[PDB]
Amino acid sequence: LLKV
Amino acid sequence: DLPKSVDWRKKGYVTPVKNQKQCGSSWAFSATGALEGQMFRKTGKLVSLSEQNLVDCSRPQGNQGCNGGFMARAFQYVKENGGLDSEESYPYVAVDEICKYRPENSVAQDTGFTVVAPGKEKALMKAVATVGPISVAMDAGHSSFQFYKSGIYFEPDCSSKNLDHGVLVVGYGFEGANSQNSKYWLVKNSWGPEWGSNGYVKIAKDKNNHCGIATAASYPNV
Ligand SMILES: [Cl-]
């Protein structure tokens, strides 16, 4: 998952 | 029996926290983190490994670069490929690029990988205590995780089955005086040193496989  | 706590960072097995930036490559950081620790156990030298080599070259093994992948498929690529380049020789740029693997720059190898029994937190504890850092997948899809800062992470909405992020368990421990109370897994993320606790997160341990940390764990065989 990407950091937002 | 197993130690009451383990922290491989204190023994030189773990590189400084990295940052995958805006690319779905946590699986690559989790895999290089586990191979970094196994190569250190084998040779005594800590060498940062190339996530970009995995992003660009492991499509044949079923990874999709910046669109996702799995650590076991990465260890499968390193075995089939015969090697993996250093971070220095094959730098991370966070976008899918042409494969430029160079055998002469390889600094790691593996013969395949070992799987931890799915869902078994005590099997995972034994792997962490006797092998070194272990690649794991987790459910990180929550604002509580994005904004995590300290303490034992416990999110009620966490899944132990539908996981979406690869991370690295570098140890485990407990808060307080009772080694069985408030246990946690020590986890290295790839969102930079600035995220969480110097880039790490304590995830609740022996609390029904919280966030799925023991659902899909594995480590390379060197
Ligand atoms: Cl990702």
Residues of A in contact with B22 (CB under 8 A): 2
The DSSP annotation for chain B comes to ---S-EEGGGGT--PPP-B--SSB-HHHHHHHHHHHHHHHHHHS----B-HHHHHHH-GGGT--TTB---HHHHHHHHHHHT-EEBTTTS---SS-------GGGEEE--S-EEEPPTT-HHHHHHHHHHT--EEEEE---SHHHHT--SSEE--TT--SSS--EEEEEEEEEESSSSTTSSEEEEEE-SB-TTSTBTTEEEEE-SSSSGGGTTTS-EEE--
Distance B85 CA to ligand 1 centre (A): 20
Residue B54 and residue B75 in contact, taking contact as beta carbons nearer than 8 Å: no
| Distance from C-alpha of B17 to C-alpha of B102, rounded to nearest angstrom | 25
What was the resolution (in A) of this experimentally determined structure?
Answer: 1.7
Tokens of B107: 């600094």
**Mutation site, B18, B191, B194, B195, interface A, largest A CB count within 10 A:** B191
Give distance in angstroms: CA of B6 to centre of ligand 1.
26
Question: Chain B: which residues have CB within 8 Å of chain A?
Answer: 20-24, 26, 140-141, 146, 164-165, 191-192, 195
Quick one: which of B187, B218, B182, B221 has its CA closest to B202? B187
- B71-81 helix and B26-43 helix, angle to the nearest 10 degrees: 50
Q: How far apart are CA B38 and CA B46, in angstroms?
A: 9
Q: Do A3 and B140 touch (CB under 8 A)?
A: no
Answer whether B167's CB lies under 8 Å from B199's CB.
no
- Residue ranges of domains in chain B: 6-220
- What CATH class does B6-220 carry? alpha beta
Contact B79, B110 (CB under 8 A): yes
How was this structure obtained? X-ray
Question: CA–CA separation, B3 vs B183, rounded Å?
Answer: 13
Looking at the partner chain, which of A1, A3, A4 has a beta carbon nearest the beta carbon of B164? A1
DSSP state of A3: -
Cα(B174)–Cα(B78) distance, integer angstroms: 35
DSSP state of A4: -
Ligand 1 center to B172 CA (angstroms): 23
Q: Which string of b and e fits B171-186 if b means at least 16 CB within 10 Å?
A: bbbbeeeeeeebbbbb
Q: Which two tokens stand for residue B21?
A: 């930036």
Q: CB distance B26–A3 less than 8 Å?
A: no
